[PDB]
Ligand binder design. Sequence first.
Ligand SMILES: *[C@@H]1O[C@H](CO)[C@@H](O[C@@H]2O[C@H](CO)[C@@H](O)[C@H](O)[C@H]2NC(C)=O)[C@H](O)[C@H]1NC(C)=O
Ligand SMILES: OC[C@H]1O[C@@H](O[C@H]2[C@H](O)[C@@H](O)[C@H](O)O[C@@H]2CO)[C@H](O)[C@@H](O)[C@H]1O
Length: 246
Amino acid sequence: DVSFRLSGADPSSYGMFIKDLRNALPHTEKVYNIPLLLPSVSGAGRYLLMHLFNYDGNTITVAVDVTNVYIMGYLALTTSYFFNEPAADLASQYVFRSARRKITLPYSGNYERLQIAAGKPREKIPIGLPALDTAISTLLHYDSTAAAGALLVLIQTTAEAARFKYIEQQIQERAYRDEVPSSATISLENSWSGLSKQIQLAQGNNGVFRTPTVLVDSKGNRVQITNVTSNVVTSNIQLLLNTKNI
Ligand SMILES: *[C@@H]1O[C@H](CO)[C@@H](O[C@@H]2O[C@H](CO)[C@@H](O)[C@H](O)[C@H]2NC(C)=O)[C@H](O)[C@H]1NC(C)=O
Ligand SMILES: OC[C@H]1O[C@@H](O[C@H]2[C@H](O)[C@@H](O)[C@H](O)O[C@@H]2CO)[C@H](O)[C@@H](O)[C@H]1O
């Protein structure tokens, strides 16, 4: 398991949590030096447990699919909650079996469905460490509209931060003040899968991408990623989604 506490949290301990979150994910190959996530893992070992503690010391445990860094659901006191999706339903046969009930949320984990449930796109949802504190607190007592938005915070401050160093850095800047994510942040989130694919495909194409990727950059500019010498590949991405899951 990995575990982050918001009390005493500062950019340092957050970064160290995000470091642990990346290191808990297993892999047997790096591709251009980037850990490559497994095509699949079997039974309970597919699932990473994150213990998260809000500023007051209350806690949820979040189950993460180690092959893709998707949140399956979480344990809040004695009630387990899981997205309405086959993967999460699978996950529920291995994690938090001893919860007193299990609730299935009325949406999948997809950013699109979570946005409808929340009634606002990610662009307009502040994120940061204080926002991650709100979100932990929310998920402690069921409320599905509120949870949509608490989960969109949670995905971005954990999973999306572990995937990209840039988004980890965006969170660390917001240690004490929330802020809507930059467009570049939405851009990377949306591109994770195509980047993972084109990183893997570059490797017998002399590090050239078969299909270029369009991103927005940190300065709000549209930019095009064409091979593995780009900063996105060299510095930014930290985990690759296996093409055997794309
Ligand atoms: C791989 O992508 C790099 C960009 O990171 C390409 O080099 C860039 O492309 C043109 C010049 O050819 C310029 O717009 C950029 O300023 C270049 N940037 C840097 C930092 O060199 C490179 O051409 C691509 N590789 C191939 C074979 O096309
Ligand atoms: O979309 C971002 C969101 O991905 C979810 O994955 C969705 C997937 O994109 C969609 O095809 C399907 O309906 O549900 C998937 C979940 O199994 C993740 O669940 C979530 O954590 C974010 O990564």
